[PDB]
Amino acid sequence: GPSRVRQNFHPDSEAAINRQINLELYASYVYLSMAYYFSRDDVALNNFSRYFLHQSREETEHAEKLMRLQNQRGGRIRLQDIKKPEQDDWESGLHAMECALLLEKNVNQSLLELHALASDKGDPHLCDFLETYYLNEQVKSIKELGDHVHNLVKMGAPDAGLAEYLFDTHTLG
Amino acid sequence: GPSRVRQNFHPDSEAAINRQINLELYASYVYLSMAYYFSRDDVALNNFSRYFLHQSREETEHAEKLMRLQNQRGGRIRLQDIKKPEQDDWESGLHAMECALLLEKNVNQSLLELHALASDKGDPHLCDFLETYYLNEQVKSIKELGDHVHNLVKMGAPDAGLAEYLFDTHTLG
Amino acid sequence: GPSRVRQNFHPDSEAAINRQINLELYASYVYLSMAYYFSRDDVALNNFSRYFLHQSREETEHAEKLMRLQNQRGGRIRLQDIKKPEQDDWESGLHAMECALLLEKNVNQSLLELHALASDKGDPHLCDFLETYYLNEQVKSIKELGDHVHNLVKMGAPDAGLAEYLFDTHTLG
Amino acid sequence: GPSRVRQNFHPDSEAAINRQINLELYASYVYLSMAYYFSRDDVALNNFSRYFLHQSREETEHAEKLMRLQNQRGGRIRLQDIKKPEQDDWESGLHAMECALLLEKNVNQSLLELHALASDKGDPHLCDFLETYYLNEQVKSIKELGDHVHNLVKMGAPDAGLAEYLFDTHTLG
Amino acid sequence: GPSRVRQNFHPDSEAAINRQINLELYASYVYLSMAYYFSRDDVALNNFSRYFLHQSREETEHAEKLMRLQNQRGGRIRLQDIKKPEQDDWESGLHAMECALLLEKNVNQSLLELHALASDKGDPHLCDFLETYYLNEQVKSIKELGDHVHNLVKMGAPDAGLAEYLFDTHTLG
Amino acid sequence: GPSRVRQNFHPDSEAAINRQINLELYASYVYLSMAYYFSRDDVALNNFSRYFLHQSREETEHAEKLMRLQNQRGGRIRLQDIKKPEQDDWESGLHAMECALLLEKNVNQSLLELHALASDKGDPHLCDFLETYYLNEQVKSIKELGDHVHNLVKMGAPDAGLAEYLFDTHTLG
Ligand SMILES: [Cl-]
Ligand SMILES: [Cl-]
Ligand SMILES: [Cl-]
Ligand SMILES: [Cl-]
Ligand SMILES: [Cl-]
Ligand SMILES: [Cl-]
Ligand SMILES: [Cl-]
Ligand SMILES: [Cl-]
Ligand SMILES: [Cl-]
Ligand SMILES: [Cl-]
Ligand SMILES: [Cl-]
Ligand SMILES: [Cl-]
Ligand SMILES: [Cl-]
Ligand SMILES: [Cl-]
Ligand SMILES: [Cl-]
Ligand SMILES: [Cl-]
Ligand SMILES: [Cl-]
Ligand SMILES: [Cl-]
Ligand SMILES: [Cl-]
Ligand SMILES: [Cl-]
Ligand SMILES: [Cl-]
Ligand SMILES: [Cl-]
Ligand SMILES: [Cl-]
Ligand SMILES: [Cl-]
Ligand SMILES: [Cl-]
Ligand SMILES: [Cl-]
Ligand SMILES: [Cl-]
Ligand SMILES: [Cl-]
Ligand SMILES: [Cl-]
Ligand SMILES: [Cl-]
Ligand SMILES: [Cl-]
Ligand SMILES: [Cl-]
Ligand SMILES: [Fe+2]
Ligand SMILES: [Fe+2]
Ligand SMILES: [Fe+2]
Ligand SMILES: [Fe+2]
Ligand SMILES: [Fe+2]
Ligand SMILES: [Fe+2]
Ligand SMILES: [Fe+2]
Ligand SMILES: [Fe+2]
Ligand SMILES: [Fe+2]
Ligand SMILES: [Fe+2]
Ligand SMILES: [Fe+2]
Ligand SMILES: [Fe+2]
Ligand SMILES: [Fe+2]
Ligand SMILES: [Fe+2]
Ligand SMILES: [Fe+2]
Ligand SMILES: [Fe+2]
Ligand SMILES: [Fe+2]
Ligand SMILES: [Fe+2]
Ligand SMILES: [Fe+2]
Ligand SMILES: [Fe+2]
Ligand SMILES: [Fe+2]
Ligand SMILES: [Fe+2]
Ligand SMILES: [Fe+2]
Ligand SMILES: [Fe+2]
Ligand SMILES: [Fe+2]
Ligand SMILES: [Fe+2]
Ligand SMILES: [Fe+2]
Ligand SMILES: [Fe+2]
Ligand SMILES: [Fe+2]
Ligand SMILES: [Fe+2]
Ligand SMILES: [Fe+2]
Ligand SMILES: [Fe+2]
Ligand SMILES: [Fe+2]
Ligand SMILES: [Fe+2]
Ligand SMILES: [Fe+2]
Ligand SMILES: [Fe+2]
Ligand SMILES: [Fe+2]
Ligand SMILES: [Fe+2]
Ligand SMILES: [Fe+2]
Ligand SMILES: [Fe+2]
Ligand SMILES: [Fe+2]
Ligand SMILES: [Fe+2]
Ligand SMILES: [Fe+2]
Ligand SMILES: [Fe+2]
Ligand SMILES: [Fe+2]
Ligand SMILES: [Fe+2]
Ligand SMILES: [Fe+2]
Ligand SMILES: [Fe+2]
Ligand SMILES: [Mg+2]
Ligand SMILES: [Mg+2]
Ligand SMILES: [Mg+2]
Ligand SMILES: [Mg+2]
Ligand SMILES: [Mg+2]
Ligand SMILES: [Mg+2]
Ligand SMILES: [Mg+2]
Ligand SMILES: [Mg+2]
Ligand SMILES: [Mg+2]
Ligand SMILES: [Mg+2]
Ligand SMILES: [Mg+2]
Ligand SMILES: [Mg+2]
Ligand SMILES: [Mg+2]
Ligand SMILES: [Mg+2]
Ligand SMILES: [Mg+2]
Ligand SMILES: [Mg+2]
Ligand SMILES: [Mg+2]
Ligand SMILES: [Mg+2]
Known part of the structure; x- marks a missing residue:
């Protein structure tokens, strides 16, 4: 108290x-739930399953990089x-896909608030961390989900019998 | 009488x-019939044909492993x-696909009754044999057929003109 | 009715x-039975077993080629x-071996009657099919079984203790 | 209702x-917490960190295999x-290490109760699943943690200054 | 007391x-004795020797896997x-060969009694261990020895001068 | 009686x-016991385990070479x-390690008495056999065990918490 490594690291930043970390682990869990929905015998869209399982594992990566940051800066993970x-x-x-898009925008808003806090606290290391590893990843993810939602809507999902089947096999395959 | 190899092998188990064996050979024949239905000039779904031909050959494998078990344990194939x-x-x-699903559930029920008999007769070798080579294979097969039935129903088979054609080429291809 | 592919294909030929097909599937089953007889603990001639298992699988091939012919010509498999x-x-x-030889001669007689029917009905495609894939195969099979029966008889099978053992390991091995 | 795949699968088994699944995800989270404790600047045992991170990822695998089982059998993940x-x-x-050992024994007890339930409900597929993928894994894990606890105790951990450092570099490295 | 690893492991199971372990080491010793009988100058059947030496080494493996199980479960080897x-x-x-067949059936009976005890004590780990590594191995071994005894009897062993010599060189070679 | 191979081979030598052979098999069993002691959860020195398991297997080799010698010379294994x-x-x-050293010296004494007997009986083949395959092996083994005992004593085993752990990982690893 304080950690021998800690420097220019505000308690508010540590808490945020x-x-x-909790929000990224939550996002991982949401995607895991979706992945196993698509493997139900009465859903059986294996590429939707694979897509969301991959997203789940990426969110765990996002959580871990923040956990590493906490240790790097001398904060304490809670x-x-x-x-x-x-x-x-x-x-x-x-x-x-629509729920995932809303989730990603919510996580993005949290990251933007974290960046505003880091800016307010004069923490350029934390600002750069968020810009380098989080903000563009979120923009890419939101755009990809937007693209997917548009194609599924245009194709007539969910009621048009061929739409999700064909999207599963040609876009997500 | 008895076979010099026979040990802890009840006559009821031998008969079951x-x-x-007969049921697995029957399942092979059902699938062979289906395979050649799909190669008719007025059906011509070559990947449905290939899928059921493969299932036919797997059922022959299932029959042969039971025939080998009979000999291994000193029973007599009838x-x-x-x-x-x-x-x-x-x-x-x-x-x-719906008929195959019903067949697989019927064969599964027979295997579960065989396992119950083996349990009743204190035959852990036979129980393990069924668990190792039959019960999970059946669960996997039933699940796969369930997945296929769901997708075909949702796609509008059999009356929607594109449904079976597209499923043939994208799922079974 | 009729199939859009059907041409010069007599209903009698279709039935024959x-x-x-049934006879070839029967021959497959006979050989399967023989294969597993030779793997009994009180018989244990593993190369006789392998030989008859191979013959069983060849007969299934023979059945399937006829099933394919039925579809090719626009007949209906029954x-x-x-x-x-x-x-x-x-x-x-x-x-x-003696039973297999009799079986093969019986199947040959059926094929010769089928060829006579095809000839009577002016079906050169069916005649050629039988000549190309069945008649010489049968002659080769009958000759091979004749050779095996002769050697086993001369060697003193079944009562001479070394005969079947030595034939198993040197001819069928 | 019920799932077209469901067979011999008791609602009590589905709930258990x-x-x-929840317990395996909890175990994953415990190990993740431990992994990042060992990467603190005031702990800095990088091979303890790696060891627990690996255990965390294995527990997620354990959770996913149960989620897959639920779908395979036609149950619904909750x-x-x-x-x-x-x-x-x-x-x-x-x-x-001592906390991990207690956790693993607790998870083992839950698995043994699940096996007893599956046995009571005459579900040999579920019994085999647990035996094949869970029970021996748990015994191996408990034994490994026991070995680690013994060596650390004998070496004088946690107060002997060299003990955890040397165990980190020679056993876990 | 008890071992920090021990869980659901009955003292009766530990003793059994x-x-x-003793019985498997005994079986190893029996086979070692047989191996070196066949290398006597007045016996000189080198492939019988090799066959029984291999069986001896397999029985030591069987003993060691049980010794490992004892340690894994926190029992104490005695x-x-x-x-x-x-x-x-x-x-x-x-x-x-006839003595080996009797030995293998005796060891099998002991394993079946061990499985019955494990079942009685609600130890599914021990049941699975026996099913996975012992019971099918024993059935295979008994069947192989049955096959060998049958061929040797039919060939006229031990009095027919060529029988054991030819079996040595063609079956065991 | 006597064996057609026997020459210059005294009955006393055959008995010795x-x-x-019995003593070498006993030594193998001692080492096997030690190997599995070191794999206990409350001992867990895996390289001590490996070291003694290797010694166990070498002693079986020593027994077998004497069994082969008995047959080579026309004696009868008892x-x-x-x-x-x-x-x-x-x-x-x-x-x-101290017990192993005492065992090896005891086995050495028995071998020296066997060499003295062979000398007394004018059996240079047996003398050479012992010199070639046994006496230097024993000297090497005794020296190695002496080295190990000295290092463990100097390091403070068994009470110094790091000693056996460090010897396990640096000398026996
Ligand atoms: Cl600070
Ligand atoms: Cl809350
Ligand atoms: Cl700043
Ligand atoms: Cl898209
Ligand atoms: Cl559509
Ligand atoms: Cl019996
Ligand atoms: Cl009937
Ligand atoms: Cl049982
Ligand atoms: Cl599907
Ligand atoms: Cl359509
Ligand atoms: Cl398409
Ligand atoms: Cl026509
Ligand atoms: Cl009839
Ligand atoms: Cl013609
Ligand atoms: Cl021939
Ligand atoms: Cl003869
Ligand atoms: Cl059910
Ligand atoms: Cl709560
Ligand atoms: Cl059950
Ligand atoms: Cl350890
Ligand atoms: Cl220290
Ligand atoms: Cl216990
Ligand atoms: Cl006694
Ligand atoms: Cl149990
Ligand atoms: Cl044999
Ligand atoms: Cl003879
Ligand atoms: Cl010969
Ligand atoms: Cl002499
Ligand atoms: Cl005594
Ligand atoms: Cl001399
Ligand atoms: Cl040393
Ligand atoms: Cl020390
Ligand atoms: Fe939150
Ligand atoms: Fe809640
Ligand atoms: Fe992504
Ligand atoms: Fe990715
Ligand atoms: Fe994220
Ligand atoms: Fe995200
Ligand atoms: Fe930047
Ligand atoms: Fe993303
Ligand atoms: Fe039946
Ligand atoms: Fe009928
Ligand atoms: Fe299949
Ligand atoms: Fe397959
Ligand atoms: Fe089957
Ligand atoms: Fe099936
Ligand atoms: Fe069981
Ligand atoms: Fe299947
Ligand atoms: Fe017929
Ligand atoms: Fe009949
Ligand atoms: Fe043939
Ligand atoms: Fe062939
Ligand atoms: Fe044929
Ligand atoms: Fe034929
Ligand atoms: Fe021709
Ligand atoms: Fe043929
Ligand atoms: Fe819970
Ligand atoms: Fe709480
Ligand atoms: Fe692990
Ligand atoms: Fe692993
Ligand atoms: Fe787990
Ligand atoms: Fe675990
Ligand atoms: Fe099993
Ligand atoms: Fe584990
Ligand atoms: Fe005993
Ligand atoms: Fe005795
Ligand atoms: Fe063996
Ligand atoms: Fe082997
Ligand atoms: Fe054994
Ligand atoms: Fe054995
Ligand atoms: Fe064996
Ligand atoms: Fe002695
Ligand atoms: Fe004693
Ligand atoms: Fe050595
Ligand atoms: Fe060595
Ligand atoms: Fe020795
Ligand atoms: Fe020694
Ligand atoms: Fe020498
Ligand atoms: Fe040595
Ligand atoms: Fe070191
Ligand atoms: Mg300081
Ligand atoms: Mg603070
Ligand atoms: Mg999938
Ligand atoms: Mg007898
Ligand atoms: Mg009977
Ligand atoms: Mg085709
Ligand atoms: Mg037309
Ligand atoms: Mg007609
Ligand atoms: Mg065979
Ligand atoms: Mg339905
Ligand atoms: Mg319910
Ligand atoms: Mg690290
Ligand atoms: Mg304790
Ligand atoms: Mg006790
Ligand atoms: Mg030899
Ligand atoms: Mg003479
Ligand atoms: Mg004497
Ligand atoms: Mg070890």
Whole structure:
């Protein structure tokens, strides 16, 4: 107290990083739920399953990089419960994509608030960390999900019988 | 009488294995019938044909492993007629998949009854044999057929003109 | 009705091909029975087992080529029960070989009657099919079985203790 | 309702599998917490960190295989909150190892109760699943942790200055 | 007391595993005795020698896997004298094969009793261990020895001068 | 009677070789016991385990070469019970090493007495056999064990917490 490594690292930043870790672990859990929805016998869209499983594992990576940052800067990781997702039954490929898009925008908003806090606290290391590893990743993710939602809507998902099947095999395959 | 190899092998188990051999050979014949239905000039779904031909050959493997078990344990194989399948004309890709699912559940029920008999007779070798080579294979097969039935139903098979054609080329291809 | 592919294909030929399919599947089953007789603990002639298992699989090939022919010509496959073999206990390597020789001659006679029918119906495609894929195969098979029976008889099978053992390891190995 | 795949799968088993999924995800989170404790600047045992991170990822694998089983059998995954671990500060390499050993024994007890339930419900597929993928894994894990605890105790951890350092570099390296 | 690893492991099971270790070491010694009988100048059947030496080494493997199990589960290995085999002079290749068959059936009976005890004590780990590594190995071994005894009897062993010589060179070579 | 191969081979030598075979098999069993002591969860010195397991297998080799010698010279192998080791709990790495050193010196004394007997009986083949394959092996083994005991004593085994751990990983690893 303080850590021999700690320098220019505000307690508010440390707390906000702990909250961000929880949010990234939550996002991982949401995607894991979606992945296994798509492998149900009455859904059986294996490339939607693979896509969301990959997203789940990326969110765990996002959480771990923040945990590493906490240690690097001499903060102390404080974990909290990972809340269950809002749904187990995700309804359709389109609905899951729309929910993922909303999730990603929510996580983006949290990251932008974290960047504003880091700026306020004169922490350019933390600002750069977020810019380098988080903000463009989020923009790319949101854009990709937007593209997917548009194609599924235009194709007639979820009610048009061929739409999710064909998107599964040609876009996500 | 008895075989110099026979040990802890109840006559009821020996008889039940003979009945299971017949059922696996019957399942092989059903799938062979389906395979050649799909190669008719007025059906011509070559990947449905290939899929069911593969399933036919797997069922022969299942029969042979039970025949080998009978010899290994010192029982005597007693073959019976292999009954013809219930249909020659299987109507559609969806109908064949639904019939295959029912067949697999029926074969599964027979295997579960065989496991219950082996348990009752204190035959852990036979229990393990069924668990190792049959029960999970059946669960996997039933799940795969369930997945296929769901996709074909959602796509609008059998009446939607593109459904079986597209499933043939993208899932079974 | 008729199939858009059907041409110069008599209903009698179509029916005779269905009967031939059943006979080839029956021959496969006979050989499968023999194969597993030779793997009994009280018989244990592993190369006799392998030899008859191979013959079993070849007969399934013979059945499938006729099933393909039926579809190619626009006929409709009509499957029937596959009758069990005449024996489960095949007595000896010599007896099995003698039974196989009789089976092959019986199947040959059926093929010759099928060729006579095809000739009568002016079906040169069917005549050529039988000549190309069946008649010489049968002559080769009958000759091979004749050779095997002669050697086993001369060697003193089944009662001479070394005969089947030595034939198993030097001719069939 | 029910799933077209469901067979011999009791609702109690389905519920117990959902509880087991939560427990495996909890174990993953415990190990993740431990991994990042060991990377603190005031702990800095990088091979303890790597060891627990690996264990964390294995527990996620354990959770996923149960999620797959639920879908395979036609049950429905029902996720719950993942509770935070009991500690963020794990005190020492020895204490973390002792906590991991207790966790593994607790998870083992849950698996044994699940196997007893599956047995009671006559579900040999579920029994075999647990035996094949879970029970021996748990015994191996408990034994390994026991070995590690013994060596650390004998070496004088946590107070002997060289003990955890040397164990980190020679056993876990 | 108890071992920090021990869980769901009954003292009766621990004792029965110690007895099984002794029996497997005894079986190894029997086979070692047989191997060196066949290398006598007045026996000189080098492939019978090699066959039994291999079986001896496999039995040591069986003993070691049980010793490892004892440690894995937190039991304590308690070794006893390894009794000498019943004979040094094994009389003939046929007699040795018949003695080996009886030995294997006796060891199998002991394993089945061990499985019944494990079942009674609700130890699915131990049941699976026996099923996975012991019970099918025993069935395979008994069947192989049955096959060998049958061929040697039919060939006229031990009195027919060529029988053991030819079996040595063609089956065991 | 006598063996057609026997020449210059005294009955006393034949008997002494049988006693030596038993002693080498006993030494193998002692080392096997030690190997599995070191794999206990409350000992867990895996390189001590590996070292003694290797020594166990070498002693079996020593026994087999004497069994081969007996046959080569036309003597008859006479096996006896293999007595259990003096301990199951070997107390420590140092104590096991000290017990192994005493065992090796005892086996050496027996070999020297065997050489004296062979000399007395004018058997230069047996003298050379012992010199070539046994006497220098024993001197090397005794020296190696002496080296190990010295290092463990100097390092402070068994009570110094780091000693056996460090010797396990740097000398025996
Ligand atoms: Cl600071
Ligand atoms: Cl809350
Ligand atoms: Cl700044
Ligand atoms: Cl897209
Ligand atoms: Cl559509
Ligand atoms: Cl029996
Ligand atoms: Cl009937
Ligand atoms: Cl049982
Ligand atoms: Cl599908
Ligand atoms: Cl359509
Ligand atoms: Cl398409
Ligand atoms: Cl026509
Ligand atoms: Cl009839
Ligand atoms: Cl013509
Ligand atoms: Cl021939
Ligand atoms: Cl003869
Ligand atoms: Cl059910
Ligand atoms: Cl709660
Ligand atoms: Cl059950
Ligand atoms: Cl360790
Ligand atoms: Cl220290
Ligand atoms: Cl216990
Ligand atoms: Cl006694
Ligand atoms: Cl149990
Ligand atoms: Cl044999
Ligand atoms: Cl002879
Ligand atoms: Cl020969
Ligand atoms: Cl002499
Ligand atoms: Cl005594
Ligand atoms: Cl001399
Ligand atoms: Cl040394
Ligand atoms: Cl020390
Ligand atoms: Fe939050
Ligand atoms: Fe992504
Ligand atoms: Fe990625
Ligand atoms: Fe993220
Ligand atoms: Fe909640
Ligand atoms: Fe994200
Ligand atoms: Fe930048
Ligand atoms: Fe992303
Ligand atoms: Fe039946
Ligand atoms: Fe399949
Ligand atoms: Fe396959
Ligand atoms: Fe099957
Ligand atoms: Fe019928
Ligand atoms: Fe099947
Ligand atoms: Fe079981
Ligand atoms: Fe299958
Ligand atoms: Fe017929
Ligand atoms: Fe052939
Ligand atoms: Fe062939
Ligand atoms: Fe044929
Ligand atoms: Fe009949
Ligand atoms: Fe034929
Ligand atoms: Fe021709
Ligand atoms: Fe042929
Ligand atoms: Fe729980
Ligand atoms: Fe692990
Ligand atoms: Fe691993
Ligand atoms: Fe786990
Ligand atoms: Fe809480
Ligand atoms: Fe675990
Ligand atoms: Fe199993
Ligand atoms: Fe583990
Ligand atoms: Fe015993
Ligand atoms: Fe073997
Ligand atoms: Fe082997
Ligand atoms: Fe054994
Ligand atoms: Fe005795
Ligand atoms: Fe054995
Ligand atoms: Fe064996
Ligand atoms: Fe002695
Ligand atoms: Fe050595
Ligand atoms: Fe060596
Ligand atoms: Fe030795
Ligand atoms: Fe004693
Ligand atoms: Fe030695
Ligand atoms: Fe020399
Ligand atoms: Fe040595
Ligand atoms: Fe070192
Ligand atoms: Mg300082
Ligand atoms: Mg603070
Ligand atoms: Mg998938
Ligand atoms: Mg007998
Ligand atoms: Mg009977
Ligand atoms: Mg085709
Ligand atoms: Mg037309
Ligand atoms: Mg007609
Ligand atoms: Mg075979
Ligand atoms: Mg339905
Ligand atoms: Mg329910
Ligand atoms: Mg690290
Ligand atoms: Mg304790
Ligand atoms: Mg006790
Ligand atoms: Mg040899
Ligand atoms: Mg003479
Ligand atoms: Mg004498
Ligand atoms: Mg080891």
